[PDB]
């Protein structure tokens, strides 16, 4: 697309509205960007003569913008975003801008949990193949910084903020891994709504791959995967795909159910996207997981700290605990901004002797609650940590799942699970 000459106004300065900044300005366009926090992150990394705005949205120049850039963490709900939206002006996001310019195949991975974890894959898949990849998006790279001439794959993992401002996007291969609550305070009509924004994937995608045992992965025919039922599902376990056996998944370094469907998501979105399968099962066998995400960072006499740091809602704190073996206690810390989740979920994984829960950040109370003969509640995690620190017996597990966003306390959640991992090599 063409930007020459054109008023664009970027909401946002984070790593998004920088990459965006430097888009434009590469482009021959200088963009304003405004932030509503007083002194947001990508202040000090600005080029001096990008005019800005911080505190609040600025109207002028909303209204008198050409092109709106949002980045995902402003709601398009925002009444001074629905006033220009309502003038007819344009809004779009990074992704938005990214397809426009993209010039090889993208895959796009959205869910509520997995999707860091299948988009690496998927990358991991097209390396082993010898193909020029680009992985980014919500993982943490901004995709504008993918766009590459020599690049021949794109791997983008998306959130439903994302996906809310793109409708550009034809992926030739698309999945929702699941749908569990998570971004609440920001989906007023609810869950609905939330899937509703991640269901966007699947316009004008070649492939859709959807979870057959998740009905809200579906379009309201896709490609499935599931357990027991599934285009690719489970069979010692195997990943099949239908009726055939294509890997024992003792060759992989990933356990735990969840990530073997993942690692079929995985397989399935490569298999679409025209990636030969036996280097795409090569790399499963490679793969050895993420940082922060139940990430072993000190195993000392007899007990392991598991930094879960990712476990940013409930659906993944779940798919930590479910099916969890601990020899002895579980020091289970969850804390942070809930995002008005319902927690009551976690209840049936804390029953038992041998659960303790340390509950810390903005909704600690309501975390303790869940169990209150088992739980003690702290200002912080560090507080929370020195606690329990004493406590921890041989055989004991120390799991930092919070099940919650950690932006009430920390930059993000990489933060938090460095500040556990340290915390646990001084204490175990
Ligand atoms: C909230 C969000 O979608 N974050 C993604 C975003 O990061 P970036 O730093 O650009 O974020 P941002 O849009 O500036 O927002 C960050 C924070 O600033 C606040 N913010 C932002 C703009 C504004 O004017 N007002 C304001 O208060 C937001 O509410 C949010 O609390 O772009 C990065 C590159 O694409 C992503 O890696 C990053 O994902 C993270 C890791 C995440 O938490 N994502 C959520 C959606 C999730 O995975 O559930």
């Given at each position: 697309?063409?930007?020459?000459?054109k008023?664009?106004?970027?909401?946002?300065?984070?790593?998004?509205?920088?990459?965006?900044?430097?888009?434009?300005?590469?482009?021959?366009?200088?963009p304003?960007?405004?932030?509503?926090?007083?002194?947001?992150?990508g202040?000090?990394?600005?080029?001096?003569?990008?005019?800005?705005?911080?505190?609040?949205?600025?109207?002028?120049?909303?209204?008198?913008?050409?092109?709106?850039?949002?980045?995902?963490?402003?709601?398009?709900?925002?009444?001074?975003?629905?006033?220009?939206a309502?003038?007819?002006?344009?809004?779009?996001?990074?992704?938005?801008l990214?397809?426009?310019?993209?010039q090889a195949?993208?895959?796009?991975?959205?869910?509520?949990?997995?999707?860091?974890?299948?988009?690496?894959?998927?990358?991991?898949?097209?390396?082993?193949?010898?193909?020029?990849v680009?992985?980014?998006?919500?993982?943490?790279?901004?995709?504008?910084?993918?766009?590459?001439?020599?690049?021949?794959?794109?791997?983008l993992?998306?959130?439903?903020?994302?996906?809310?401002?793109?409708?550009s996007?034809?992926?030739?291969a698309?999945?929702?891994?699941?749908v569990?609550?998570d971004?609440?305070?920001?989906?007023?009509?609810?869950?609905?709504?939330?899937?509703?924004?991640?269901?966007?994937?699947?316009?004008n995608?070649?492939?859709?791959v959807?979870?057959?045992?998740?009905?809200?992965?579906?379009?309201?025919?896709?490609?499935?995967?599931?357990?027991?039922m599934?285009?690719?599902?489970?069979?010692?376990?195997?990943?099949?795909?239908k009726?055939?056996?294509?890997?024992?998944?003792?060759?992989?370094?990933?356990?735990?159910?969840?990530?073997?469907?993942?690692?079929?998501?995985?397989?399935?979105?490569?298999?679409?996207?025209?990636?030969?399968?036996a280097?795409?099962?090569?790399?499963?066998?490679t793969?050895?997981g993420?940082?922060?995400?139940?990430e072993?960072?000190?195993?000392?006499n007899?007990?392991?700290?598991?930094?879960?740091?990712?476990?940013?809602?409930?659906g993944?704190?779940?798919a930590?605990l479910?099916?969890?073996?601990?020899?002895?206690?579980?020091?289970?810390?969850?804390?942070?901004?809930?995002k008005?989740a319902?927690?009551?979920?976690?209840?049936?994984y804390?029953n038992?002797?041998?659960?303790?829960?340390?509950?810390?950040?903005?909704?600690?109370?309501?975390?303790?609650?869940?169990?209150?003969?088992?739980?003690?509640?702290?200002?912080?995690?560090?507080q929370?940590?020195?606690l329990?620190?004493?406590?921890?017996?041989?055989?004991?597990?120390?799991?930092?799942?919070?099940?919650?966003?950690?932006?009430?306390?920390?930059?993000?959640?990489?933060?938090?699970?460095?500040?556990?991992?340290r915390l646990?090599?001084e204490l175990?």
């Amino acid at each position: 697309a063409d930007y020459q000459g054109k008023n664009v106004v970027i909401i946002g300065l984070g790593l998004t509205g920088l990459s965006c900044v430097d888009f434009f300005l590469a482009r021959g366009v200088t963009p304003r960007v405004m932030d509503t926090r007083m002194t947001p992150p990508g202040l000090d990394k600005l080029p001096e003569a990008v005019e800005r705005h911080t505190g609040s949205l600025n109207d002028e120049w909303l209204m008198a913008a050409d092109l709106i850039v949002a980045s995902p963490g402003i709601a398009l709900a925002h009444p001074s975003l629905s006033a220009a939206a309502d003038a007819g002006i344009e809004i779009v996001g990074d992704i938005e801008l990214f397809c426009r310019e993209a010039q090889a195949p993208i895959v796009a991975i959205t869910g509520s949990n997995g999707k860091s974890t299948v988009t690496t894959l998927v990358g991991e898949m097209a390396k082993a193949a010898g193909v020029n990849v680009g992985v980014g998006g919500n993982i943490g790279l901004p995709a504008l910084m993918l766009l590459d001439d020599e690049c021949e794959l794109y791997v983008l993992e998306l959130s439903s903020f994302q996906l809310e401002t793109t409708s550009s996007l034809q992926a030739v291969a698309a999945t929702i891994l699941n749908v569990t609550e998570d971004h609440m305070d920001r989906y007023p009509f609810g869950l609905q709504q939330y899937r509703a924004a991640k269901l966007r994937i699947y316009e004008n995608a070649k492939v859709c791959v959807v979870n057959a045992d998740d009905a809200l992965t579906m379009p309201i025919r896709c490609v499935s995967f599931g357990v027991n039922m599934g285009d690719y599902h489970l069979n010692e376990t195997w990943l099949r795909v239908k009726g055939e056996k294509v890997l024992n998944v003792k060759e992989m370094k990933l356990s735990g159910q969840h990530n073997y469907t993942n690692a079929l998501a995985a397989l399935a979105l490569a298999d679409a996207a025209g990636l030969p399968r036996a280097s795409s099962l090569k790399a499963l066998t490679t793969f050895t997981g993420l940082p922060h995400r139940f990430e072993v960072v000190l195993e000392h006499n007899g007990v392991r700290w598991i930094n879960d740091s990712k476990a940013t809602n409930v659906g993944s704190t779940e798919a930590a605990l479910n099916g969890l073996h601990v020899d002895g206690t579980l020091h289970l810390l969850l804390g942070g901004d809930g995002k008005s989740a319902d927690f009551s979920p976690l209840a049936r994984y804390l029953n038992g002797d041998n659960v303790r829960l340390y509950c810390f950040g903005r909704d600690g109370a309501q975390l303790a609650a869940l169990r209150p003969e088992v739980a003690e509640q702290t200002e912080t995690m560090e507080q929370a940590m020195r606690l329990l620190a004493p406590r921890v017996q041989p055989g004991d597990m120390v799991l930092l799942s919070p099940a919650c966003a950690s932006l009430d306390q920390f930059k993000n959640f990489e933060q938090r699970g460095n500040e556990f991992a340290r915390l646990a090599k001084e204490l175990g």
